[PDB]
Symmetry: C3
């Protein structure tokens, strides 16, 4: 939730900067760089999707505690 | 659920591609890249591990929201 | 160390390897690589922060379950 979106905001922008630098370095170094940014993109996309799953559970318990508080 | 698995599968696929391409430059060249690849290999295994742990905490939201109907 | 923290620990130990490799090879490679070394640490930090939220939800579920089981 909250902190994860702020760390996403910083990390995504820095990953997009590495993709920008790849689109300015198109063979100016190892071909691996077009695979490294693409790996970091796929790793980032897992964190970006976890932002919803690790929100469903987290707001899950913050709703469920208020249902328990109707009888506790 | 089906989405996070696709992102993990794609990150696993692209890690297998990145490690294979690192093997293709057999010896010297960038050097530094032999640490970059192994970072994302460890990040991939760590993202896998918390995506496995995700299921157990998701099953606990399912268990809680079901058994709250036995509290009253 | 659970499962999770061993991969994060070996990733963390790899950042010290990748930073000393970047400090040694500071005058060779694509400029992209000096942004990757920092951005993959922001990915590690996001994985660790998400792991701390996985700890918070699975703790949360036990604290909710202790209250649900006192009335069910
Ligand atoms: C009685 O049972 C429980 C009550 C509350 C919680 C619970 C769950 C998660 C959080 C974490 N959290 C939230 O989930 C959160 C809490 C609130 C709120 O309670 O005021 C709000 C809000 O209502 O705006 C928004 C968030 C969020 O991140 O989306 C924030 C606030 C604390 C600092 C922090 C650090 C890193 C990431 C997130 C968080 C805390 C307690 C668990 C069991």
């Amino acid at each position: 939730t909250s902190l994860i979106h702020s760390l996403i905001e910083e990390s995504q922008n820095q990953q997009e900067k590495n993709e920008q630098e790849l689109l300015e370095l198109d063979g100016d170094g190892p071909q691996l760089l077009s695979g490294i940014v693409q790996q970091q993109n796929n790793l980032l996309r897992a964190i970006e999707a976890q932002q919803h799953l690790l929100q469903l559970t987290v707001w899950g318990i913050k709703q469920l505690q208020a249902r328990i508080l109707a009888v506790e």
